[PDB]
Amino acid sequence: CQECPPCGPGEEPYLSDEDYGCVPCPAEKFSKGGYQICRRHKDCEGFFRATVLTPGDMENDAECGPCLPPRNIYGMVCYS
Amino acid sequence: QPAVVHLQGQGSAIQVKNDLSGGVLNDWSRITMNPKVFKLHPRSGELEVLVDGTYFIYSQVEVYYINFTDFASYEVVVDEKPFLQCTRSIETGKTNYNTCYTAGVCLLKARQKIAVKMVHADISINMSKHTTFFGAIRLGEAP
Amino acid sequence: QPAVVHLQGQGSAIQVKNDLSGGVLNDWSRITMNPKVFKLHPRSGELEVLVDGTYFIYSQVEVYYINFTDFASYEVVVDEKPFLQCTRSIETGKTNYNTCYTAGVCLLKARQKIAVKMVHADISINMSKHTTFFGAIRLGEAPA
């Protein structure tokens, strides 16, 4: 009983001789996993915030900064 | 005893018009799935039954952003054919946190595909494990 | 049976002389790909074939602006050696959106890398996910 072939950062499992492998991640998506599927970047309007750390393909999720696009200033999910 | 299943949103928020295939939610997590009665197809997001019976099916979707609609709506489809429908009027153009729950009971036949399908395209759904979930319970024998 | 790959541009607008290294388009978003037959190098923009075979390779590049050249061109290269070449004369100093498609069949050996290489000019490319793409079909084996 061996371990399922782990994936690299910015790459998600490709399940289907079995052609099970690892495919890269789409443009607005990332993967900090070995068996984690590819997921979308953190939302600026879903959190009401701005982007301090612009997101990338691997071990790189979007990190939000402040939230004043009307004028929201609170710690986790901020509001008016 | 009876077999139950409770799928969950695996974490990140999705855009229906881009991250989905025909508005069908597919990012599920088999947390307490009974293997004797249910089988989930990950790429499609279909909850397939294995035993002919009476099933109580529940679901919840968290919609937080809409464009071009005035209302968000979804169907609980039984073989790409509607059974239940949950619709909620939401403010268009802005963030509105709303969980939308629907549940019902119906007789099912084996190898039947159940899915959660959004009727509109421009929707932002938060696939959280606590706000978005999809479940089914075999209550018993089909009359 | 057949193994395919389709890559799309990631939205942004590339200026080739300032955004690319040697004209090679690198920001490819994979939408369909067999990782057993294909491999994607993001920093280099290469599409490696991992097995021997007969490949149908295609590409499309959306050029929207040109400076002092009026000659927008690119090549589908294999191991830096050209195979296909798409040329397009455009009015200079004016935004003119126009997609540029080329495709062809060739025999490839395992580990050969394929890329989309722009000519060294002040060209502007709109890397939209629907106007700028790069793909391939492994039709079958490469005989003898």
Author numbering:
A (entry chain C): 44 to 59, 66 to 118, 127 to 137
B (entry chain B): 247 to 389
C (entry chain A): 247 to 390
Give the article text.
EDA is a tumor necrosis factor (TNF) family member, which functions together with its cognate receptor EDAR during ectodermal organ development. EDA·A1 and EDA·A2 interact with two distinct receptors EDAR and XEDAR respectively via binding of their THDs to the cysteine-rich domains (CRDS) in their receptors. Here, we report the crystal structure of EDA C-terminal TNF homology domain bound to the N-terminal cysteine-rich domains of EDAR.
To reveal the structural basis for the interaction between EDA·A1THD and EDARCRDS, we crystallized the EDA·A1THD-EDARCRDS complex and determined its structure using the single-wavelength anomalous dispersion (SAD) method at a resolution of 2.8 Å. The crystal structure reveals that EDA·A1THD and EDARCRDS form a heterohexameric complex, displaying a triangular-shaped architecture with an EDA·A1THD trimer in the center and three EDARCRDS molecules at the vertexes of the complex. Each EDARCRDS molecular binds across the convex surface of a single EDA·A1THD in the trimer, burying about 1340 Å2 of total solvent accessible surface area at the intermolecular interface. The driving force for the binding of EDA·A1THD to EDARCRDS is predominantly electrostatic interactions via three pairs of charged patches on the surfaces of the receptor and the ligand with complementary electrostatic potentials. A cluster of acidic and polar residues in EDA·A1THD (Gln256, Gln261, Asp265, Asp273) mediate a panel of electrostatic interactions with positively charged residues in EDARCRD2 (Lys78, Arg88, Arg89), tightly tethering antiparallel β3-β4 motif of EDARCRDS to the surface of EDA·A1THD. Instead, the presence of Val307 and Glu308 extend the length of strand βC of EDA·A1THD so that the aromatic sidechains of Tyr310, Try311 and Tyr343 pack together to form a hydrophobic patch that makes intimate contacts with helix α1 from EDARCDR2. Our crystal structure predicts that a glutamate substitution of Ala259 would severely deform the saddle-shaped depression of EDA·A1 whereas a glycine replacement of Asp265 reduces the acidic surface area at the interface.
